[PDB]
Amino acid sequence: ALRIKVISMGNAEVGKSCIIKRYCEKRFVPKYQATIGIDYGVTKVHIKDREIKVNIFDMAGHPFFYEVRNEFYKDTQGVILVYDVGHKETFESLDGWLAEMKQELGPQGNIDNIVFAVCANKIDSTKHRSVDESEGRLWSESKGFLYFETSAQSGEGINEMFQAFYSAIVDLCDNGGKRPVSAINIGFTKEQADSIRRIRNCKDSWDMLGVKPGATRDEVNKAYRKLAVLLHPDKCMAPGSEDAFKAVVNARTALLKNIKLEHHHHH
Ligand SMILES: Nc1nc2c(ncn2[C@@H]2O[C@H](COP(=O)(O)OP(=O)(O)OP(=O)(O)O)[C@@H](O)[C@H]2O)c(=O)[nH]1
Ligand SMILES: [Mg+2]
């Protein structure tokens, strides 16, 4: 039986609690009760035919609770990221939510092994709609997130979002908690293809990472990591990316070896 952790993020009054209670407790009330810091609960779901025990940390969206929320970003498998189509400041704030999560995970952190369901919520409201499906779908899908139009009041989109959410999370768990490689684009970036070819026909390790002689260890480190995320054969399906990755790895150590050796014979 699978044990996972789900959190909710997004501005106050956006509907995080009511999305969760609509699907898990089959209930909805119009009366607002702001989450105070964080609400913890356990629910059980059966998706695929894996039995999933879901630890939910429903977070409070008000900024006053910044310090309360920071403890609960680590070891997260799924995120319910919510805004209100009727209030565009909640959609714009979503970059800040990603930033806040990304720092509580440190530089190790790869939100790419986390499933995100973006919920454009309250589509049922008569009120003037200020965020359109194009804009939210583009912001979400361009980041590898799922996107759904939802209403906790009507139920629209709720069951479909949660079914897609938990299936992506089951797929993530069956792959060791690493983002599953999707057949829907075993293609590859153009800059990926350029970097692989530029790395074949390169005979110098300075130019292989894009740095000139006399570079800090910290600069060759930071050149290396941007190529590593670009070219790792797990992430990049282009032919020859494994050899390009190996070449980048070996170049980094060639430079790091001579840097520290020139620091030891000089100063
Ligand atoms: N019309 C409409 N109202 C909604 C919908 N979802 C939530 N609400 C209302 O919006 C208010 C806020 O909903 P919550 O779920 O408590 O919002 P929240 O994101 O949990 O807010 P905080 O916990 O304070 O961050 C409540 O009054 C809900 O009734 C919706 O889909 N449609
Ligand atoms: Mg809440």
UniProtKB/Swiss-Prot annotation:
Localization: Nucleus
Listed InterPro entries: DnaJ_domain, J_dom_sf, P-loop_NTPase, Small_GTP-bd, Small_GTPase
Pfam families (alphabetical): DnaJ, Ras
A GO cellular component annotation in the UniProt record: phagocytic vesicle
Keywords: GTP-binding, Nucleotide-binding, Nucleus
SUPFAM superfamilies for this protein: Chaperone J-domain, P-loop containing nucleoside triphosphate hydrolases
GO biological process, one term: phagosome-lysosome fusion
Residue numbers binding GTP: 10-17, 58-62, 121-124
GO MF entry, a single one: GTP binding
Source taxon at top rank: Eukaryota
CDD domains: DnaJ, RJL
J domain segment(s): 204-260
Job of this protein: GTPase possibly involved in regulation of the MEK/ERK pathway.
Family: Belongs to the small GTPase superfamily. Rab family.
Protein's name in the database: DnaJ homolog subfamily C member 27-A
Gene that specifies this protein: dnajc27-a
